[PDB]
Amino acid sequence: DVLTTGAGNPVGDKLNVITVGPRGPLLVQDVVFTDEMAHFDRERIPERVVHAKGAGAFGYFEVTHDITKYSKAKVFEHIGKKTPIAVRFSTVAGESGSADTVRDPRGFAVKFYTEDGNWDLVGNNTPIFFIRDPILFPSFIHSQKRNPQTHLKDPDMVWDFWSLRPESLHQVSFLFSDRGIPDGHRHMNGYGSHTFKLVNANGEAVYCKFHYKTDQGIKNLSVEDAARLSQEDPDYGIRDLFNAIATGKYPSWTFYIQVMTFNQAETFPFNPFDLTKVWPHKDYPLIPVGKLVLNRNPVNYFAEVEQIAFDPSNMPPGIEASPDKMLQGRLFAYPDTHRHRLGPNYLHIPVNCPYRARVANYQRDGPMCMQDNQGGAPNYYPNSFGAPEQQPSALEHSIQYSGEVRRFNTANDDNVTQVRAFYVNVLNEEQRKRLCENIAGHLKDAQIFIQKKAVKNFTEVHPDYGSHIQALLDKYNAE
Template sequence: MSTTDKNLTTSWGAPVGDNQNSMTAGSRGPTLIQDVHLLEKLAHFNRERVPERVVHAKGAGAHGHFEVTNDLSQYTKASFLSGVGKRTPMFVRFSTVAGELGSSDTVRDPRGFALKFYTEEGNYDLVGNNTPVFFIRDAIKFPDFIHTQKRHPQTHLKNPTAVWDFWSLSPESLHQVTILMSDRGIPATLRHMHGFGSHTFKWVNAAGQAVWVKYHFKTEQGVKNLDVTLAAKLAGEHPDYHTEDLFNAIDQGDFPAWTCYVQIMPLEDADTYRFDPFDVTKVWSQKDYPLIELGRMVLDRNPENYFAEVEQATFSPGAFVPGIEASPDKMLQGRLFAYADAHRYRVGTNHNTLPINRPHAEVNHYQRDGQMTSDSNGGKSVYYEPNSFGGPTEAPQAKPAAFPVSGLAESVAFDHSDHYTQAGDLYRLLSEEERARLVETVVGAMTPVEKEEIKIRQIGHFYKADPEYGQRVAAGLGLSLPEGL
């Protein structure tokens, strides 16, 4: 049968006799409720949009693969990292953070860098950003932070006062704010930016020995950023610029690639390092823990359907495989729950059975039922455990490595409160031209803030990072430095 010979059907497979005219009582009569094809079309149309992501709503994705170029199996037993030349299929989603689904690609915002590895031991998700740090370091602050990035409940407009009020009261944000307000805040394309796992993770080898690890994905296209004037022009004239660029590059055979490196820290160093290695607002010095090449990521195939493959793709930092585990990073600990829970709400409790999320490894569990059950639902097999009927059982060799815990159960802050050294180091690494653009961007972003005390408080943070940094921002805003500095 040729394509033109195919019958249009309902979702239950029955042929549709008329798809142009609804059924009515007489030629001018009211529409009949018995026109089930009409009702199905309208009902499905009303439900075509799943709730957009609360954060990272606007995104683009592609398929590819990861190839190991350096065998680091002495540090991790993860099978997909075992042996030079080992290839693992992947799906990658890039995104902005704060904007809605229809927002512009070229706004000043961090970019999500979410990777799904379809390994033989199950899916491994690495859900990071194009920055090595984040604004906050405890998940309990995340809803409040994101509220400041969203719209005012009365005006429904973006609210710079809320943004800078929160940042000025959360000095741990200064490192990420400096990155965001620098040239790196607006990547030229999704292909011309680095990616980071951001958090600290734990690798465990076959002997049960563990190390702490951070991931770095360095773009092979080179880092390029957009001038603010061009970015604003593109935001108005071509809001899907990054999405189109990624699609066209892959479509034309210009496959983007990233080289993956890791930093490895011995477990015992976490107790003595000059910064808390589990504080996601900090980086590890590459002089202390040099980059070690691990592999190469290549994106070489576009999605066939955006909704099915990009919008319904779900990533969770808690999707681990044997050999990779969590660290005590308090932001990571919160994300282990929050991401998967968001997917259960947004896409459905069976989101991992969708083709884009379905593991390439065999899946055996006792979860049953729930909305959108699209597989056999376990058939007639045993549906509880333990059982006497040969159902799947646990694999003791896959248990996470034991780790010591101590202290009181209480709400505590991080021990290290130095929010300024690394932000100041970053400022001093910039050229004079880059510093000037950074200050100009900060001044422009802070000018609309309604309360002067917020501006003064934030200027104090800039000054503590580097006196010149604070002085230039203060001068740009026409304000004096805070007393006591």
């Protein structure tokens, strides 16, 4: 193989630079050096604003059951249908150099390359989240990140925000339970979290929840181990995933959904669209749909993992968004941030390209335009020259909403009920004790006035929750 410059010019020697004499200065004509150096100098792009640390693999999605009565989406079109998928696992707060085995939620994004375009299901390992209004997401994330002056993690920031926004109770509980630190990516479940809308061939709609359970089973790391691992192998999650697939132990998840008719959405105790709530299985049981199988490792991490981009707004006919405020905000945020992190034409990047689909429209140009830019095809719509036409079949399902167009406060929607049921029913005493210790061990670094409001909140879920945490805190502050 002949070593070349970016323009393909053979290189004579790329181990020594051109100089005027053996001990003289460097010359501009040594374009070989500059060409390489200039590229080295531009190797980095900005990391994801959140979920920066990640692992990636590829595979397919396979339909196992008929749910066409609910969704007309081609990805579900017929039993046994296989569609290629791209998956990206990740943590949340930490940046590119951080450890994988730390307490944090886990991203679990799945990209389906369907013939009706790509369908990005950007979920995580928890069915719920910390807040229910997108406008608090930047603040939340800031509080989870580094102090603006010291650039250090700040318990005060974390808990002042959480104590002031108690709706964070439900997810804060899930996050500090054993599931706060899964043993790798293959031993956790995935959830779309938000409520989405399914539409069938008949134009009738229903609301759903997406779920994909680990076929390898749930397995978590104790805090002792997680800590040891955060230092022995910060990239433990990446290694584990890549070695499994590499050795043929292809991990898979069983994909189900929960269905809620519009009526049920009403009789539902709470706001069905509040991200801090779940749909109790007992009441809305899981419906089998298919499998997700990861059977291929990336070849080039930067090209296939760092540059991949998932947009919740990527939804094909049969799948639509619900009124969930959080999701509504995510419809804008992802493409927006992608045009920034990656570039105006990031969808032309191989992994983000909707290759099983025929992309035709009236969009043109932009930096780094790679394709033919759709040749000389007429660029305005409508036109009398046979350019791409719109197709009615893919029209969105319309609903009539009532009320004024204003800001409705949801800070006071139920913040503790489901949290109680999870604390006293779902968990057992061990889990319950640990839950308290993990919270206590982290909250203890916060200022006391913050510690106090935090505990009041936990007390509202259950006096035992708060009081036991308060006990450990006392122990901690005793020192």
